[PDB]
Enzyme design. Structure first.
Site, PDB file in Angstrom:
ATOM      1  N   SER A 248       1.578  32.325 -37.763  1.00 41.99           N
ATOM      2  CA  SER A 248       2.098  31.983 -38.891  1.00 41.99           C
ATOM      3  C   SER A 248       1.338  32.413 -40.111  1.00 41.99           C
ATOM      4  O   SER A 248       1.859  32.707 -41.109  1.00 41.99           O
ATOM      5  CB  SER A 248       1.954  30.263 -38.788  1.00 41.99           C
ATOM      6  OG  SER A 248       0.599  29.919 -39.006  1.00 41.99           O
ATOM      7  N   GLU A 249       0.063  32.309 -40.250  1.00 39.92           N
ATOM      8  CA  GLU A 249      -0.809  33.208 -41.165  1.00 39.92           C
ATOM      9  C   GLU A 249      -1.726  34.020 -40.133  1.00 39.92           C
ATOM     10  O   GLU A 249      -2.740  33.863 -39.702  1.00 39.92           O
ATOM     11  CB  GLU A 249      -1.591  32.025 -41.707  1.00 39.92           C
ATOM     12  CG  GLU A 249      -0.871  31.373 -42.827  1.00 39.92           C
ATOM     13  CD  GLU A 249      -1.844  30.101 -43.414  1.00 39.92           C
ATOM     14  OE1 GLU A 249      -2.653  29.583 -42.862  1.00 39.92           O
ATOM     15  OE2 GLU A 249      -1.598  29.784 -44.778  1.00 39.92           O
TER      16      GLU A 249
ATOM     17  N   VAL B 190      -4.243  22.546 -34.836  1.00 39.42           N
ATOM     18  CA  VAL B 190      -5.382  21.493 -35.182  1.00 39.42           C
ATOM     19  C   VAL B 190      -4.908  20.577 -36.329  1.00 39.42           C
ATOM     20  O   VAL B 190      -4.394  20.765 -37.346  1.00 39.42           O
ATOM     21  CB  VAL B 190      -6.627  22.254 -35.663  1.00 39.42           C
ATOM     22  CG1 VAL B 190      -7.783  21.109 -35.778  1.00 39.42           C
ATOM     23  CG2 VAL B 190      -7.159  23.255 -34.708  1.00 39.42           C
TER      24      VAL B 190
ATOM     25  N   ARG C 260     -11.335  22.596 -39.664  1.00 34.77           N
ATOM     26  CA  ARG C 260     -12.288  23.219 -40.246  1.00 34.77           C
ATOM     27  C   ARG C 260     -13.759  22.727 -39.633  1.00 34.77           C
ATOM     28  O   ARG C 260     -14.580  22.468 -40.099  1.00 34.77           O
ATOM     29  CB  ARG C 260     -12.535  23.324 -41.816  1.00 34.77           C
ATOM     30  CG  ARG C 260     -11.388  24.009 -42.418  1.00 34.77           C
ATOM     31  CD  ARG C 260     -11.234  25.565 -42.008  1.00 34.77           C
ATOM     32  NE  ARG C 260     -10.181  25.989 -42.697  1.00 34.77           N
ATOM     33  CZ  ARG C 260      -9.080  26.053 -42.334  1.00 34.77           C
ATOM     34  NH1 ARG C 260      -8.556  25.213 -41.426  1.00 34.77           N
ATOM     35  NH2 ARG C 260      -7.984  26.941 -42.881  1.00 34.77           N
TER      36      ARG C 260
ATOM     37  N   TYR D  88      -6.529  35.217 -36.980  1.00 38.22           N
ATOM     38  CA  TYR D  88      -6.923  35.563 -35.746  1.00 38.22           C
ATOM     39  C   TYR D  88      -7.740  36.972 -35.764  1.00 38.22           C
ATOM     40  O   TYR D  88      -8.296  37.335 -34.584  1.00 38.22           O
ATOM     41  CB  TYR D  88      -5.724  35.631 -34.806  1.00 38.22           C
ATOM     42  CG  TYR D  88      -4.989  34.396 -34.623  1.00 38.22           C
ATOM     43  CD1 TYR D  88      -5.225  33.510 -34.141  1.00 38.22           C
ATOM     44  CD2 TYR D  88      -3.557  34.495 -35.413  1.00 38.22           C
ATOM     45  CE1 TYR D  88      -4.377  32.201 -33.755  1.00 38.22           C
ATOM     46  CE2 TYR D  88      -3.033  33.204 -35.169  1.00 38.22           C
ATOM     47  CZ  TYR D  88      -3.443  32.150 -34.422  1.00 38.22           C
ATOM     48  OH  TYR D  88      -2.574  31.122 -34.317  1.00 38.22           O
TER      49      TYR D  88
ATOM     50  N   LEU E 263     -10.627  25.439 -33.124  1.00 40.64           N
ATOM     51  CA  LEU E 263      -9.709  26.532 -32.723  1.00 40.64           C
ATOM     52  C   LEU E 263     -10.737  27.621 -32.079  1.00 40.64           C
ATOM     53  O   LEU E 263     -10.388  28.110 -31.133  1.00 40.64           O
ATOM     54  CB  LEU E 263      -9.057  27.023 -34.067  1.00 40.64           C
ATOM     55  CG  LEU E 263      -8.430  28.684 -33.532  1.00 40.64           C
ATOM     56  CD1 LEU E 263      -7.351  28.480 -32.452  1.00 40.64           C
ATOM     57  CD2 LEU E 263      -7.821  29.017 -34.928  1.00 40.64           C
ATOM     58  N   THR E 264     -11.945  27.679 -32.787  1.00 36.21           N
ATOM     59  CA  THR E 264     -12.948  28.841 -32.427  1.00 36.21           C
ATOM     60  C   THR E 264     -13.327  28.346 -30.697  1.00 36.21           C
ATOM     61  O   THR E 264     -13.322  29.276 -29.912  1.00 36.21           O
ATOM     62  CB  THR E 264     -14.303  28.618 -33.118  1.00 36.21           C
ATOM     63  OG1 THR E 264     -13.814  28.937 -34.236  1.00 36.21           O
ATOM     64  CG2 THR E 264     -14.981  29.678 -32.538  1.00 36.21           C
TER      65      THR E 264
ATOM     66  N   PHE F 288       8.402  33.294 -29.721  1.00 43.31           N
ATOM     67  CA  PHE F 288       7.592  32.405 -28.638  1.00 43.31           C
ATOM     68  C   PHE F 288       6.376  31.992 -29.563  1.00 43.31           C
ATOM     69  O   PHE F 288       5.988  30.692 -29.354  1.00 43.31           O
ATOM     70  CB  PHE F 288       7.079  33.020 -27.432  1.00 43.31           C
ATOM     71  CG  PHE F 288       5.975  34.080 -27.634  1.00 43.31           C
ATOM     72  CD1 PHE F 288       4.814  34.073 -28.037  1.00 43.31           C
ATOM     73  CD2 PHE F 288       6.525  35.492 -27.684  1.00 43.31           C
ATOM     74  CE1 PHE F 288       3.770  34.805 -28.118  1.00 43.31           C
ATOM     75  CE2 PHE F 288       5.847  36.327 -27.940  1.00 43.31           C
ATOM     76  CZ  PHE F 288       4.263  36.115 -28.119  1.00 43.31           C
TER      77      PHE F 288
END
Ligand SMILES: CC(=O)SCCNC(=O)CCNC(=O)[C@H](O)C(C)(C)COP(=O)(O)OP(=O)(O)OC[C@H]1O[C@@H](n2cnc3c(N)ncnc32)[C@H](O)[C@@H]1OP(=O)(O)O
Ligand SMILES: CC(=O)SCCNC(=O)CCNC(=O)[C@H](O)C(C)(C)COP(=O)(O)OP(=O)(O)OC[C@H]1O[C@@H](n2cnc3c(N)ncnc32)[C@H](O)[C@@H]1OP(=O)(O)O
Ligand SMILES: CC(=O)SCCNC(=O)CCNC(=O)[C@H](O)C(C)(C)COP(=O)(O)OP(=O)(O)OC[C@H]1O[C@@H](n2cnc3c(N)ncnc32)[C@H](O)[C@@H]1OP(=O)(O)O
Ligand SMILES: CC(=O)SCCNC(=O)CCNC(=O)[C@H](O)C(C)(C)COP(=O)(O)OP(=O)(O)OC[C@H]1O[C@@H](n2cnc3c(N)ncnc32)[C@H](O)[C@@H]1OP(=O)(O)O
Lengths: 405, 406, 406, 403
Positions: C118-119, C84, C90, C123, C94-95, C406
């Site tokens: 990545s973080e 994003v 924020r 998720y 994404l949601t 990936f």
């Protein structure tokens, strides 16, 4: 056999620049040299030539700088001062300084400015350190603002340099009258300042530009920064952040501070009293390293003191000593305030005595005149005159470094 | 776990009181520091919470006096030993101790409270504002030559014991600090702590040394406090303090420290951001300057505090002050001040500037520009031209400096 | 400002799509990576938000196939390219993309989704749970001798070109991955991306090299992918992958990398936490092992996903599953599984274990113990003895391993 | 140069014995450690070589009891103080001391021996195998927030003296260790050494601190041992609780402590509950290394004393190179509620050495991985798979207190 002359052609200019970069132990960046040519006046770039190459250089850009009070006066932007190591300590720099300072007085420029690189060099020619800059860095996770910082309704957008250049000059010209030390930027200067040079890409990455829009769609802030990816601890090397209102300023910074994957930020060349330093809730989280920035050489002392404004009323007589140019020495009566400034030779008793480099150090309000006197570098001849002079020579807004030259 | 707010009862309680404070700071209790600092500790000013077995929170203040812009020496509460044990945190203990202390400071006639902030973000909510900064100056001694016009004088230097130092340096200290706002008066008890050869500082470097500068006639005119840190020739000098009564003695003493033969790097922590040494050096970048917070100011009696200091220029301004933590101080103040006069009154006239008490404390010592705080959005200008003139008046030609540690 | 969620329209749109994704990751678009990964990209699986001029958010998935405990190969959504733009963060973008993707994953008959975060903390709110870990193995090659009983065999090794490597390594890979849960099937296009001599990895070390291990009869039985990093002799070998069809070829290939002259340190990122090399080494501490997240699992079809895998031991348990992000999946399931059977059905019997869908995904690959999650308070046991037996069944004698990136 | 193998004779001999061991480890003798460890030292279990003037080799063992998979606490020889002076190395002194010790271990009825390996490759030749690992957990405290569903409870925490700590922590320790295989029983003498504010550790960090977690009713339910290092570090020695709420609350106390930036927990479990409480798993760095090596002295007894995560019926061909009397074929019949191991004549399913059997004995090393690596041989298809699952355990083994 050495010859003092100007640049004869761009082929001679590319060799002129190649020798200057060679003194700095750098390969000539062809992209930086090409873009700076657009505002290079070949009659102002002087140096010594031995018939086979350049061995010394010294240049000056015709620029305009903001003074305390909002005045935008013409200034010599001294640049590309080099002497090849095979011709050093032989007087080549001394000659070029004498020729340039006389040429600066010709074009009406009341003073000269340049970035120090090494400060102890130009003090003998009358230059004095008048502007400091701070390198601000730290962890963006620790840089939360004070709870009363208003971010406003503004919106931000990552945009190309041209939409940036379509709004940023309007934002820049509106705020710099209140920022003494900043210089006006023509289209050819914005092109070099926003240049995506390959050398800075080696240090971080390609340049990016942000614009801040108010709720009604008006541009009110911008940002120039370069991302350095790392692992996740990426770095944001900030080049410039400005806003026409406190909300656009704080919103643009909070945008950079909240960037995902970023952990460390760096803002070099910032003001020693940058607004960001006081927005952070925890001051120690934003490390501040202060160093030299701009040196000032007053060429027309009576006009220079009359061109700026003073934070309070002052009636002081200064016994100026210009060791490099003894014709500029004299005794002037300075009658200045917030809205007036006059400087004329006077035969009355002197209040203060100091060199022209010390008068240039305190010219932009970055160095206190009182501190220079308590240190033994300036002499008070009549009691009380130094304290009132140091206050008037000051300014509520500290001077800041302009764009690089 | 029943908590009681009370003061220190005796020395056995005082040592346990200090033990918890050191424990919260993750440090073993330094018996040399605790014993020598007791000599100026007022037990009735050291408050805290006690659960019947041990101290779980601490907060104290030393009765000291600080130099203000203009040379006035006024009483100040030197806040110290502010801790809350991690087992009792986020339960309101600090907020309570802050309420009792600030009220007690007002009752003792102290117009302000000063504090060295370990964590700056703690005290902003209580009305504290960062008003003084300090700079850590460091660099290679062989790159720190002075400008050619620096007069070193004909004085001589002797490294002497602390006692001979204490027989001449206090007179030198008292003579120069009227012109250095932020410095505090030093009694023999405070000189004893300031010159203490504490073991903890010996661990980082070495034993303390003392230097005295004598004029040609034998008059002591300067001094220096430093500690050596030998290394391999790669020794350091940790300078604690340098002062002189004239520019020659100041420069002569610094040149003495810089010309030590086995030294390569020197460090002076807690120096002024406008320390004279920075402008004596011929090559400014050779002396690295890192600036950070020093003293936070909490104005307890705003009208008196604003009238006790002098102002760099004439000012006639009405300040709308909002004090959220101590709302009794919220109101409008008319400030009329200059180089030789100052008056402040609660008023109902139209306000010129709007700001919080923490921001007013930030600009009180002339170390933070009121114009920058306004340009940053923290301070609001209500009448054009007011902030500019107020910012200049709240400034001072000499930047404030950090006092001795407490 | 108006945003539109859509898929990639054409090949020119694909370049702009990937350009914005790289930009959010603060990286220049890698044309070599983008070109080779297009060969297996399905444009209809790459969604994102578009403001009429550029992509401001991205989210994609590769149609891949994963080995489960027991050897079953089931379809899995290989989630990728989730970004994003910082100007639109924020704000719930994404949601929304997660709701669209998870619904789209179910339509394709994929019972689960997999992901490298990545973080990782991102998720968990969407139902993802860390199910597989990977270990970075490193150390000095001269301290990594094998145990004396390790048989290296009579094989031979050859350094070969990418073309020769790709004509023989896939056959070796396909033979071993049925017994390595978490590994994914590799088409020729995926082998091309996995063996790509990308310029970015050449900067960190050097050009990719390929090794093949041949048995005494000429049968290729092992391979290795590594990159050299010269330095002075103190060079590094960055191992990307080592595999063999028998213990001799595995050990012989590692011994080749470890005995390479001019090499001092070796590094193998993405290895299994139970990599065979760790137990071949005679001195275990000489091979440093750092464990971190690898693959997150999002169960999209709970009954099918639990029935598709096999279980290390017999289990008959009733699971009260709560799916906050997708409440339609919440319900009570009876799991009956073993080494040769597995079934999961909605039931009304009393529940034995209460847990969230993210924790169920965490233990799904046998890399996280359900007993530890229960003792940690994340999972609730309703009937005594259920968690212990269920935790053993959800385990596997072979720890799950991370697939190719990936 | 005539060497004599003997045990410690008296307290003055004990000082010289321990001093030589410290000297080989290139350390000055730590008198605080030597004095507190004497209280549980059995002089007749401390053997070594003496050249008539000084000890030139040492080898000892503490009589302890270790928790096995299933909760059984059995006696174990805690091997310690294994040294050979550098002037007498590579002459077989260690090999001789190993034969004498292992024979003494068998004579005392101890079915197994456990040991902390300084250099792991040393003891594999004697039948020792690495069976338990430990993880060093570290990271920035401000990045170690817990998942939102983690219940901290209503408990309270107190920093207490060592004496107050020792009056409540042992009861908490004894209650939880039946479910933590690898943990050893702690007598008062062992608690004294474990909580000793040793001078050597004070230099690396600071004085030891003690924390107790009390439930709402006043019942102590958790404890913690840590040392501060003034961006200050916290070196955590041990954290335990009798319920998930007290466990998380105590960790939350250490993680939220002010002035701390980094925290370190050496010797944690590879499946430490803290690792899964953290909302951002990568924020807790995890470095795994060897912990405890196991030497099975009585194979039938040791394999029958522990419980197995699932039912198993397997025949193991065990080779014991150092002690060939233990070589033979064993049938293992085990489950969650039963276990038996006996010499059998049925066909063998798996072939392995005694050191590899010890490696999988605590459920910290997979028998399948050892087989896939070529160290263990499968004789009948499907046997290793079921045996590996049974030799496992839902709770990973953890390292006991140092010895
Ligand atoms: N900016 C840059 O420095 C760019 C690179 N420049 C160079 O390398 C050149 O050597 C320069 C410009 C620094 C000096 O040029 P030169 O031709 O050597 O100068 P010149 O010979 O005219 O004399 C300069 C005077 O300033 C002093 N000076 C000049 N540069 C330096 C320096 N870098 N460090 C110390 N002193 C200096 C010299 O001592 C000299 O005074 P003195 O020689 O009477 O003692
Ligand atoms: N000096 C020291 O650093 C001593 C160590 N002290 C601590 O750890 C304690 O947490 C203290 C003293 C910092 C705070 O004391 P507390 O007992 O928690 O005070 P209290 O309970 O009244 O609340 C403190 C308030 O200041 C804030 N605060 C206090 N200290 C800090 C800090 N170091 N960092 C950030 N915020 C802080 C708290 O968030 C709270 O504000 P809130 O209402 O928004 O949460
Ligand atoms: C593709 C892969 O393999 S993983 C790649 C993704 N990782 C990246 O770093 C890509 C860069 N993109 C971003 O960082 C995006 O901004 C993302 C990933 C944070 C999500 O974008 P957003 O639109 O801002 O997310 P959205 O608003 O839809 O919801 C996010 C929710 O999770 C939280 N969240 C999401 N990502 C993070 C994070 N990295 N750290 C902390 N909290 C987070 C948000 O705060 C919010 O929770 P909330 O209700 O408590 O605030
Ligand atoms: C907590 C504990 O009790 S573990 C602490 C023990 N570890 C130490 O390092 C303590 C200091 N003592 C030593 O290092 C000793 O010299 C030891 C441990 C190496 C053993 O002493 P030695 O008398 O030399 O042992 P010994 O002669 O019986 O050697 C037996 C075999 O093991 C090998 N070996 C033992 N330790 C090592 C080692 N650290 N590195 C390499 N090989 C070793 C020997 O080379 C020899 O191999 P071989 O059978 O092929 O000849």
């Amino acid at each position: 056999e050495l010859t003092l002359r100007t640049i004869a052609d761009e082929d001679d200019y590319e060799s002129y620049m190649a020798s200057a970069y060679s003194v700095f132990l750098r390969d000539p960046q062809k992209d930086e040299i090409e873009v700076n040519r657009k505002f290079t006046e070949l009659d102002r770039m002087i140096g010594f030539h031995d018939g086979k190459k350049w061995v010394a250089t010294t240049g000056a850009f015709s620029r305009h700088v903001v003074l305390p009070g909002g005045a935008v006066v013409p200034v010599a932007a001294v640049t590309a001062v080099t002497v090849s190591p095979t011709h050093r300590r032989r007087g080549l720099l001394t000659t070029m300084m004498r020729h340039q300072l006389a040429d600066i007085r010709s074009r009406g420029e009341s003073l000269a400015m340049l970035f120090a690189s090494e400060a102890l060099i130009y003090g003998r020619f009358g230059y004095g350190v008048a502007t400091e800059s701070a390198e601000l860095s730290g962890q963006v996770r620790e840089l939360a603002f004070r709870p009363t910082v208003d971010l406003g309704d503004g919106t931000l957008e990552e945009v190309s340099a041209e939409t940036f250049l379509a709004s940023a000059p309007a934002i820049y010209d509106a705020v710099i009258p209140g920022l003494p030390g900043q210089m006006s930027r023509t289209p050819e200067w914005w092109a070099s300042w926003t240049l995506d040079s390959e050398e800075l890409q080696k240090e971080s990455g390609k340049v990016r530009f942000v614009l801040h829009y108010e709720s009604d769609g008006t541009a009110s802030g911008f940002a120039i920064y370069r991302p350095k990816p790392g692992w996740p601890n990426a770095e944001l090397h900030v080049q410039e952040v400005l806003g026409t209102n406190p909300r656009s300023y704080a919103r643009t910074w909070r945008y950079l501070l909240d960037m995902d994957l970023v952990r460390k930020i760096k803002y070099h060349g910032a003001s020693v009293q940058e607004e960001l330093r006081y927005l952070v809730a925890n001051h120690p989280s934003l490390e501040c390293v202060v160093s030299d920035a701009i040196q000032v050489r007053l060429v027309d002392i009576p006009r220079a003191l009359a061109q700026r404004r003073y934070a309070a009323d002052v009636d002081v007589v200064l016994e100026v000593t210009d060791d490099f140019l003894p014709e500029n020495s004299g005794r002037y009566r300075l009658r200045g305030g917030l809205d007036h400034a006059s400087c004329e030779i006077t035969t009355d008793d002197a209040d203060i005595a100091l060199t022209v480099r010390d008068l240039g150090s305190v010219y932009m309000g970055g160095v206190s005149l009182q501190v220079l006197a308590s240190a033994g570098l300036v002499t008070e001849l009549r009691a009380g005159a130094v304290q009132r002079a140091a206050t008037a020579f000051g300014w509520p807004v500290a001077p800041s470094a302009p764009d690089d030259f």
